Amino acid sequence: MAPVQKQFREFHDRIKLAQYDENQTLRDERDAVLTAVREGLKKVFADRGEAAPTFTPFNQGSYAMNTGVKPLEGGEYDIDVGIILNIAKDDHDPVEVKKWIRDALKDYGNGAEIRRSCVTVFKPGYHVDLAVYADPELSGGTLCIAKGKENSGDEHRLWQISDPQGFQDRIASKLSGDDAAQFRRCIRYLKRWRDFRFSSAAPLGIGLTAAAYWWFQVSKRTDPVSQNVTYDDRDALEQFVQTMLDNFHDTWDSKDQRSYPRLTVELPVQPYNDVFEKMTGMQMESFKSKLQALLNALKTAKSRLELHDACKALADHFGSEFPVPEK
Ligand SMILES: Nc1ncnc2c1ncn2[C@H]1C[C@H](O)[C@@H](COP(=O)(O)OP(=O)(O)OP(=O)(O)O)O1
Numbered sequence: 001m002a003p004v005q006k007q008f009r010e011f012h013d014r015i016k017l018a019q020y021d022e023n024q025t026l027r028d029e030r031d032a033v034l035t036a037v038r039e040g041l042k043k044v045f046a047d048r049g050e051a052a053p054t055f056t057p058f059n060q061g062s063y064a065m066n067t068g069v070k071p072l073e074g075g076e077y078d079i080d081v082g083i084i085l086n087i088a089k090d091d092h093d094p095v096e097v098k099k100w101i102r103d104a105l106k107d108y109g110n111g112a113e114i115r116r117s118c119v120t121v122f123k124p125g126y127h128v129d130l131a132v133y134a135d136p137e138l139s140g141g142t143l144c145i146a147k148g149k150e151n152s153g154d155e156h157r158l159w160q161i162s163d164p165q166g167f168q169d170r171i172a173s174k175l176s177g178d179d180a181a182q183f184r185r186c187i188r189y190l191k192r193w194r195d196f197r198f199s200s201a202a203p204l205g206i207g208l209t210a211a212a213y214w215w216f217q218v219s220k221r222t223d224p225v226s227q228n229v230t231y232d233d234r235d236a237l238e239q240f241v242q243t244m245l246d247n248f249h250d251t252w253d254s255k256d257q258r259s260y261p262r263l264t265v266e267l268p269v270q271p272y273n274d275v276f277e278k279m280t281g282m283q284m285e286s287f288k289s290k291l292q293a294l295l296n297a298l299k300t301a302k303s304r305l306e307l308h309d310a311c312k313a314l315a316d317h318f319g320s321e322f323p324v325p326e327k
Pocket residue numbers: 060061062063067068069078080167191204205206209267273274275276
């Protein structure tokens with residue numbers, strides 16, 4: 001039966017996006033937005049009659065963790081950055097804090113918008129999500145992110161304990177060397193699957209990343225004699241996807257009077273929230289179906305005599321950058 005490891009490795013080379021520490025361009029676009037916020041803030045606070053708050057920025061998201069993928073045509077890069085303002089949380093509404101950042105970014109690119117967990121600034125072919133934190137020193141020693149929107153009620157405006165560094169560290173440290181490499185490749189493969197089969201409803205990147213933290217297992221073989229190591233990414237995805245499917249739980253929804261299959265995946269650090277909690281029952285059901293059809297293709301791919309047929313089965317789920325050799 002035809003193997004597909006070479007094709008997976010090539011697919012990986014095509015989809016991977018270099019992380020911040022190796023991506024001049026990303027750093028520059030990041031540093032530009034941070035620059036705009038400092039410059040912007042000087043204005044917003046010259047109005048108020050108070051000293052501009054200072055912030056310490058740090059890298060977040062898949063570009064910090066080396067799990068980033070290139071977007072498909074008409075998709076956007078997602079530059080995630082955190083800013084820790086020299087402010088005490090208990091003295092400020094978090095939404096009001098997010099307003100400062102929005103207003104400081106009013107003019108920059110196609111402007112800024114306040115989301116539930118970040119301020120997002122738009123630009124040609126990318127966006128920057130700024131997660132906004134209060135200083136742990138002035139806030140009694142916890143790092144809290146500014147949660148809530150402009151239209152959000154009172155009980156939905158809050159400073160939620162977070163641990164982005166802890167999360168990144170667990171992703172980096174779960175494995176090492178070529179084992180960790182396979183883990184990162186498998187997250188990327190599933191992010192392209194997400195981009196290909198889900199609408200611009202989609203299994204978040206955070207979700208698949210946390211899922212992998214809990215459930216990914218390396219697939220490699222070590223020759224008993226030569227101790228030569230080869231990796232089997234197809235098999236790694238098969239076991240990982242099967243394990244995710246096994247952890248779906250039929251969950252009754254009283255309002256709708258039916259159950260939906262739901263996958264719950266806790267963040268392995270504070271606040272230990274279910275990273276999929278925002279997906280609806282119906283989007284979860286569709287997510288489970290598509291995971292099952294991906295699993296079936298991963299199995300099909302291992303029992304094809306012809307490389308063409310093995311790859312084509314994979315391309316139907318991973319999309320047209322998955323290499324299909326001619327028959
Ligand atoms: N639901 C959540 N719960 C807890 N932390 C989150 C959640 N969503 C996002 N975060 C934090 C951790 C993420 O690595 C970071 C950026 O989120 P996001 O950009 O959605 O994921 P990501 O950068 O790993 O994947 P992607 O490659 O798909 O952009 O913010």
